[PDB]
Design a protein around this ligand. Structure first.
Ligand SMILES: N[C@@H](Cc1c[nH]c2ccccc12)C(=O)N1C[C@H]2CN(Cc3c[nH]c4ccc(Cl)cc34)C[C@H]2C1
Ligand SMILES: Nc1nc2c(ncn2[C@@H]2O[C@H](COP(=O)(O)OP(=O)(O)NP(=O)(O)O)[C@@H](O)[C@H]2O)c(=O)[nH]1
Ligand SMILES: [Mg+2]
Ligand code: NA
Lengths: 167, 469, 166
């Protein structure tokens, strides 16, 4: 029936990456979560009037299992590459994540979006212009999100689905 | 009628339950949220014991209460005032007779003695299973020793004297089986000839056994203190999660060693023998319920350098293709078949730790620390119970030991494996991928031929064990 | 996976904790640290079916004797343990049997009679006397050693089978 999109979240650990998928999938209006629940990572949505199913893989917490990244990444059709706007190193990691995705998928044109995540009130160290310039150099969209207010979360995932649809 | 209680002005743990201080989930009650005073009351409740709750609380409380403050609160809980003589007791005393003291005796028997014993059980579990609080704070240990060592009165004496000894033993701090372990198996490399040890010269059964002993020991060493608060992801992870990180780094190193063994075998026929041998090791891992080992192999076979070796996998026997496929399917659909298999086998096993880490992290990140009710902030205890359900599952699989004999030389060989050498991660994984391109170039480039590198027989001895008298 | 709630009861020092830790960890505890209340879990395949045992290890010291109703309500089967070199602990068995029956309001509670410390030569309770008592209760009698593991799996897994057929 409806199309299912397999999305994969990648990015540095320890800087609030998991808030993106939690806030999407969540009971938007009750701040609660059980990740062990069968299909706490599947969500039926309507994007541009077309109903589809999102299956989201977010292995947050497993970053030290670095030799498993290829296997996890190969499951995906589209990728959210996430950094924290107050952690410059996580931003500098983005290039190697993108290169690894291209190698795993064996393509120079893989659907992906760059996501800058505000995970607390610590001072921002990556300005939006820096991230926009990086996204433009890759030919991909840039979305900023809040880990606390849900701002930008729908935009990040829906933009990625549009990149898949328009591939 | 119920026993009367001390005045809440002199004893804080006698305040009535209300939605301003405790909320229960919808046959003992399950707490959704509460003040720290109410949590400690129910932790040490006079009507029933709750050993699960003791484990949950002692595993997770530092997210809402400091260790020094917890000790102060349970000492305050312990110090219960006795009621005054009743009217009937008064009248007996005025007549020179001994009072019956019926209400006092009941309150001692049914309130004070159970609450005090359950406070001591919290202390006992705290020292036995969460001793790191005292290793990290010597003054906390002094206060605990002083509290325990000054409890008076005969009803608690056996447990006070015991807990004192347990503390002293913990400050300065053997397996029996239903059968003998199987005989250690040898192939081309013979005992003591460690310089010849390698993937194809050790016996594949014994490779899987010794890696399983190593990986089981690493799994069993991870304590909950390395997991609560998501501390293995934070800046101080090397300080707070050293056993977890050692376990993950072993898994990563073995995966990379498998990849390196494959892509540095440039001759096609020899590389088929290498991949076939690794799938046989995977078969023994499956037989041993070493799921960490199974996924080490699967991760290597799905890595970018190995996955693309179509000429190699074309020559793998169909049965081995089926073994590898059914191992890969364990991880599909968010590990659906792995989770079902783990819950069906007979331990000992070695779980894959990564799923636990993701579930602990997301539980922590996806639930609030407090619930706001009637203007009060209550500790969200349901969130802590969910974390402790995961650490409890981890601990349950840490109990059962493997009935396998250690081979010290093979163990040392795998402990010292270092496929990356002095190279950094990016340059090493780029090296592996460039080797893959060398040995099986991208179409339409032709497939080259390469000379053999192994001087010994490539035929596997197989993975069914042997048994001489 | 079916879950089974087992409770280990009996007089102080008969080996309830040693039996439980031998089952859980394959380790024999030499120390005598009197229990208040401990709980353990074990996944194990019994007669081809995987289950999850919750094992409550209870207090034998008489000072805790007024705190038993609460754990007897929750238990689904009981290991009634005495030590074969301690006749008083054998005489204490009937008090546990009667209290369990009262609390659960049933004449038909899954139980196994366990005579522990069978590695010791100096026996004071004969097998025949314990077997007679077990028959009067309608339950099996299993002699065990937490030190050597003799009988330990048999005792716990027999109790599981009696809960399963209850
Ligand atoms: N022709 C069938 C069956 C089949 C052929 N070769 C196999 C080897 C194992 C299991 C199934 C097969 C197919 O599904 N493929 C052919 C290609 C070859 N390539 C094998 C591979 C490399 N690394 C892996 C890690 C795990 C798994 Cl399951 C497989 C691999 C992947 C492609 C898929
Ligand atoms: N020889 C031998 N000693 C045993 C055996 N089981 C227990 N013991 C010893 O007997 C002592 C008491 O064991 P323990 O398990 O603590 O008994 P308990 O019944 O749990 N006591 P409590 O009711 O106070 O908690 C310990 O010294 C223990 O090593 C056994 O099978 N053989
Ligand atoms: Mg005991
Ligand atoms: Na920074």
């Amino acid at each position: 029936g409806m199309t299912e999109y397999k999305l994969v979240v990648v990015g540095a650990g320890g800087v609030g990456k998991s808030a993106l998928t939690i806030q999407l999938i969540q009971n938007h209006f009750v701040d609660e979560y059980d990740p062990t629940i069968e299909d706490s990572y599947r969500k039926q949505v309507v994007i541009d009037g077309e109903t589809c199913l999102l299956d989201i893989l977010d292995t947050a917490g497993q970053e030290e299992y670095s030799a498993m990244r290829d296997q996890y990444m190969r499951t995906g059709e589209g990728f959210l590459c996430v950094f924290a706007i107050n952690n410059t190193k996580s931003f500098e990691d983005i290039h190697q994540y993108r290169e690894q995705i291209k190698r795993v998928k064996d393509s120079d044109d893989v659907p992906m979006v760059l996501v800058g995540n505000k995970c607390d009130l610590a001072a921002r160290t990556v300005e939006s212009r820096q991230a926009q310039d990086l996204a433009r150099s890759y030919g991909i969209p840039y979305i900023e999100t809040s880990a606390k207010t849900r701002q930008g979360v729908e935009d990040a995932f829906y933009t990625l689905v549009r990149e898949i649809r328009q591939h | 009628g119920q026993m009367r209680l001390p005045s809440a002005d002199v004893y804080r743990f006698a305040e009535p339950d209300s939605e301003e201080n405790i909320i229960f989930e919808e046959g003992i009650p399950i707490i959704k949220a509460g003040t720290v005073i109410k949590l400690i009351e129910r932790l040490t409740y006079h009507m029933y014991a709750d050993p699960n709750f003791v484990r949950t609380f002692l595993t997770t409380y530092r997210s809402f209460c400091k260790p020094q403050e917890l000790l102060s609160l349970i000492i305050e809980r312990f110090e219960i005032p006795e009621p005054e003589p009743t009217e009937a007791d008064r009248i007996a005393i005025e007549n020179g007779d001994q009072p019956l003291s019926a209400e006092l005796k009941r309150f001692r028997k049914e309130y004070i003695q159970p609450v005090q014993l359950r406070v001591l059980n919290v202390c006992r579990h705290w020292v036995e299973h969460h001793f790191y609080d005292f290793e990290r704070d010597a003054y906390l240990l002094q206060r605990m020793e002083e509290f325990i060592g000054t409890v008076r009165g005969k009803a608690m004496k056996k447990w006070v004297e015991s807990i004192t000894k347990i503390i002293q033993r913990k400050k300065i701090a053997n397996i029996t089986f239903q059968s003998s372990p199987p005989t250690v198996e040898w192939h081309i490399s013979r005992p003591g000839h460690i310089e010849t040890f390698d993937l194809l010269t050790l016996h594949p059964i014994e490779i899987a056994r010794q890696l399983t002993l190593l990986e089981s020991d690493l799994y069993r060493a991870v304590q909950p203190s390395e997991l609560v608060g998501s501390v293995w992801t934070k800046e101080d992870k090397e300080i707070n999660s050293p056993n977890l990180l050692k376990m993950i780094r072993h898994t990563t190193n073995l995966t990379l060693w498998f990849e390196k063994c494959i892509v540095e075998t440039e001759n096609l026929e020899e590389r088929v023998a290498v991949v076939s041998r690794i799938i046989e090791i995977l078969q023994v891992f499956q037989e041993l319920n070493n799921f960490n080992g199974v996924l080490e192999v699967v991760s290597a076979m799905n890595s970018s350098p190995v996955y693309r070796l179509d000429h190699t996998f074309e020559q793998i026997p169909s049965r081995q293709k089926k073994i590898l496929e059914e191992a890969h399917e364990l991880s599909e659909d968010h590990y659906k078949k792995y989770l079902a298999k783990l819950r069906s086998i007979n331990p000992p096993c070695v779980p894959f730790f990564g799923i636990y880490l993701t579930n602990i992290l997301k539980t922590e990140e996806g639930n609030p620390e407090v619930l706001k009710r009637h203007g009060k902030e209550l500790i969200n205890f349901s969130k802590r119970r969910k974390v402790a359900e995961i650490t409890g599952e981890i601990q349950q699989y840490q109990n059962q030991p493997y009935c396998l004999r250690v081979e010290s030389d093979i163990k040392r060989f795998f402990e010292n494996l270092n496929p990356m050498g002095n190279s950094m991660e990016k340059e090493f994984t780029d090296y592996l991928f460039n080797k893959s391109l060398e040995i099986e170039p991208r179409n339409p480039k032709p497939l080259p031929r390469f000379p053999k590198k192994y001087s010994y027989p490539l035929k596997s001895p197989g993975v069914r064990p042997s048994n001489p008298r």
